[PDB]
Design a protein around this ligand. Structure first.
Ligand SMILES: C=C1/C(=C\C=C2/CCC[C@]3(C)[C@@H]([C@H](C)CCCC(C)(C)O)CC[C@@H]23)C[C@H](O)C[C@@H]1O
Length: 255
């Protein structure tokens, strides 16, 4: 019953651009990770907040990973059709507000349900819930984050849908501080329409069933994770000497 209009050439170009953008900005071999400050995992079987905050053993490495990732997200965003049509001010507002959410989205490629980890190479760059606690975060963020990762995994997104979702996430007209909400919304609509059209004509059943709505729900989930991350980041930042364990970029985006 539902019509399946074909992707317009323009929509085809948009998909090609976003796939190219992602391939240039996401390394599925994790080959740069050895350049980050080394992961350190202190003995913390009990999950002691006092100990976690006293050491922040995993923080330098995860801060470097996140900082690196923000740089990649900036590069990806610059390639979203329409993004450069925005004022610099609006571009920066969108990047700073969406960065952590896009990181959570893009991390799904490395996430595995084999053991519920982000596996980015050997035992060294395998990141578990216990590694995030060692960077000063609490289960109130990490457990819904893992749940989100599983939920996202199970949508079995085509890469086309994955890159569209990240672009839609970034170009959101409802971020605090945006100037030209109408232009951002127009850019987002073009992407949303591409995604909806793609799903309807290129995504096989039964995985296509209400997929667009499930993807929109993930965006809402990300808002919640963003809010919790920000709250926890604030508290983490109270730890004396914490700034040294972060990066200038991380400090700007989250401070
Ligand atoms: C980054 C990427 C990756 C994994 C993401 C992870 C695993 C470690 C813990 C992270 C980084 C989460 C953690 C809660 C962020 C903590 C950030 C600070 C600044 C400490 O408050 C969010 C996403 C998680 C690897 C992937 O290949 C690239 C992706 O950008």
């Amino acid at each position: 019953d539902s019509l399946r209009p074909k992707l317009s050439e323009e929509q085809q170009r948009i998909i090609a651009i976003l796939l190219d953008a992602h391939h240039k900005t996401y390394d599925p071999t994790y080959s740069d990770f050895c350049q980050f400050r080394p992961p350190v995992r202190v003995n913390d079987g009990g999950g002691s907040v006092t100990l976690e905050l006293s050491q922040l053993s995993m923080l330098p490495h995860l801060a470097d990973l996140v900082s690196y990732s923000i740089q990649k997200v900036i590069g990806f965003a610059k390639m979203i059709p329409g993004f450069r049509d925005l004022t610099s001010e609006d571009q920066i507002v969108l990047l700073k507000s969406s960065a952590i959410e896009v990181i959570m989205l893009r991390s799904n490629e490395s996430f595995t349900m084999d053991d519920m980890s982000w596996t980015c190479g050997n035992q060294d760059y395998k990141y578990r819930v216990s590694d995030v606690t060692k960077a000063g975060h609490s289960l109130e963020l990490i457990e819904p984050l893992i749940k989100f990762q599983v939920g996202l995994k199970k949508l079995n997104l085509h890469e086309e849908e994955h890159v569209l979702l990240m672009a839609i996430c970034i170009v959101s007209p409802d971020r605090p501080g945006v100037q030209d909400a109408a232009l951002i919304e127009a850019i987002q609509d073009r992407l949303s329409n591409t995604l909806q059209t793609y799903i309807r004509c290129r995504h096989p059943p039964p995985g296509s069933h209400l997929l667009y709505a499930k993807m929109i729900q993930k965006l809402a989930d990300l808002r919640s994770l963003n809010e919790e991350h920000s709250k926890q980041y604030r508290c983490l930042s109270f730890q004396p000497e914490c700034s040294m364990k972060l990066t200038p970029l991380v400090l700007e985006v989250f401070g």
